[PDB]
Amino acid sequence: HWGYGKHNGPEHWHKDFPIAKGERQSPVDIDTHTAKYDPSLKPLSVSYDQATSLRILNNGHAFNVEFDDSQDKAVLKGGPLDGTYRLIQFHFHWGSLDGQGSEHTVDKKKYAAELHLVHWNTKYGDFGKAVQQPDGLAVLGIFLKVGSAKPGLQKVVDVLDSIKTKGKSADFTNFDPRGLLPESLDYWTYPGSLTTPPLLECVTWIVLKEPISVSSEQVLKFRKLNFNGEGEPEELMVDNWRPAQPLKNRQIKASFK
Numbered sequence: 001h002w003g004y005g006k007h008n009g010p011e012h013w014h015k016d017f018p019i020a021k022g023e024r025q026s027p028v029d030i031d032t033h034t035a036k037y038d039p040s041l042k043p044l045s046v047s048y049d050q051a052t053s054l055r056i057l058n059n060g061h062a063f064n065v066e067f068d069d070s071q072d073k074a075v076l077k078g079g080p081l082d083g084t085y086r087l088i089q090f091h092f093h094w095g096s097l098d099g100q101g102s103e104h105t106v107d108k109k110k111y112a113a114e115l116h117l118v119h120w121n122t123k124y125g126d127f128g129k130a131v132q133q134p135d136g137l138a139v140l141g142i143f144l145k146v147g148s149a150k151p152g153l154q155k156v157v158d159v160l161d162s163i164k165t166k167g168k169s170a171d172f173t174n175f176d177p178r179g180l181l182p183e184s185l186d187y188w189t190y191p192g193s194l195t196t197p198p199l200l201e202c203v204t205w206i207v208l209k210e211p212i213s214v215s216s217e218q219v220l221k222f223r224k225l226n227f228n229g230e231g232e233p234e235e236l237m238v239d240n241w242r243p244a245q246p247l248k249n250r251q252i253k254a255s256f257k
């Protein structure tokens with residue numbers, strides 16, 4: 001199956017997932033000079049006060065913090081979005097070194113990592129139906145740079161030892177994802193896709209301009225995770241990012257002047 005190695009990585013994905021060469025693939029480079037302020041964008045609303053985290057899972061590609069999405073507990077609305085999008089999970093992509101790891105780039109700059117908060121459009125009833133729609137998902141993307149520690153990330157960092165290998169999970173209740181946000185909600189937005197197989201073109205991307213800072217020690221612990229299962233030869237979970245894809249017939253809009 002697919003992965004991030006030389007023999008199963010992004011250059012190979014198109015053979016089983018032909019949409020990999022599609023018209024609205026993600027991630028993309030964000031050319032800041034070409035992006036245009038869009039006065040039609042409504043204020044962005046991140047409403048995570050009632051978020052109910054459940055579990056953290058190493059899925060062999062990254063780790064997911066999963067949420068109870070059986071009700072409108074944690075939602076994203078406004079901005080480019082019509083209606084209500086419910087938080088289902090977050091995860092990260094990161095590098096083997098601080099100079100790489102993000103999926104989106106900004107004027108070709110790579111960040112050390114990128115956080116994806118994944119939401120589905122409630123008008124479609126469930127996540128599975130949402131990923132059959134052109135406006136099924138909204139992903140809030142946040143860049144990570146290495147500097148001062150992010151206090152709201154430490155609980156995640158500290159549980160990673162318990163989910164080292166593929167298929168391991170742990171209880172992860174009472175985690176507040178608000179602690180992962182930067183101060184500013186200024187963003188860029190464009191229509192795109194999932195950045196891993198099946199690469200479905202269902203996503204409205206909302207990428208925050210302001211990165212969060214995490215410490216070297218925090219990201220080093222991400223890099224101790226394993227792609228492999230227990231008892232198998234160790235393959236460090238690093239460089240689990242897809243590079244930028246052709247922009248094609250798209251415009252990136254900015255929320256800020």
Ligand SMILES: CCc1ccc(S(N)(=O)=O)cc1
Pocket residue numbers: 152176178179
């Ligand atoms: C838990 C982190 C956090 C940080 C700031 C806020 S707020 N927007 O100031 O109420 C809430 C929660």
Ligand SMILES: CCc1ccc(S(N)(=O)=O)cc1
Pocket residue numbers: 116118139193194195196197198
């Ligand atoms: C279907 C699972 C899934 C959910 C989110 C992503 S991503 N990396 O946020 O585009 C990829 C895959």
Ligand SMILES: [Zn+2]
Pocket residue numbers: 091092093116195
């Ligand atoms: Zn992702």
